[PDB]
């Protein structure tokens, strides 16, 4: 599911950064970190595909669908 994707079914693995908050990556169950961001999954996924700050571009490494499933999973902890 989205959890599987987020934890291990991603390359690079989202967990590795977001679990700890590497380079200030918006963490899980941390609504404040997301409040300011365009929380809309459909927007967040673009940021994810393109890359943001330390986050590399995902375009090709993870499909929008994969990403979406991971992102909604991330957001569901907030
Ligand atoms: C794994 C595929 C993965 C997902 C999914 C993911 C999502 C994600 C979102 C939705 C954001 C916010 C986008 C926005 O602000 O519009 C976000 C932000 C950051 N991430 Fe991420 N992220 C995934 C993976 C990784 C990896 C592997 C790293 C560490 C190199 C990482 C880091 C960050 C950082 C830093 C940001 C934003 C920093 C900023 O400038 O605000 N993410 N991620």
From Swiss-Prot:
It comes from Halorhodospira halophila. It comes from the Bacteria. Disulfide bonds: none annotated. The keyword Transferase does not apply. Binds 1 heme c group covalently per subunit. It holds the Pfam family Cytochrome_CBB3. This is Cytochrome c-551. PROSITE patterns: CYTC (PS51007). One of its GO terms (molecular function) is iron ion binding. Heme c binds at residues 14, 17-18, 55. Gene3D superfamilies: Cytochrome c-like domain (1.10.760.10). Keywords: Electron transport, Heme, Iron, Metal-binding, Transport.
């Amino acid at each position: 599911d989205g959890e599987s994707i987020y934890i291990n079914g991603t390359a690079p693995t989202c967990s590795s950064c977001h679990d700890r908050g590497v380079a200030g990556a918006p963490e899980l169950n941390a609504p404040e970190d997301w409040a300011d961001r365009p929380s809309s999954v459909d927007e967040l996924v673009e940021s994810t595909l393109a890359g943001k700050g330390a986050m590399p571009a995902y375009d090709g490494r993870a499909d929008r669908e994969d990403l979406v499933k991971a992102i909604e999973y991330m957001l569901s902890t907030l």
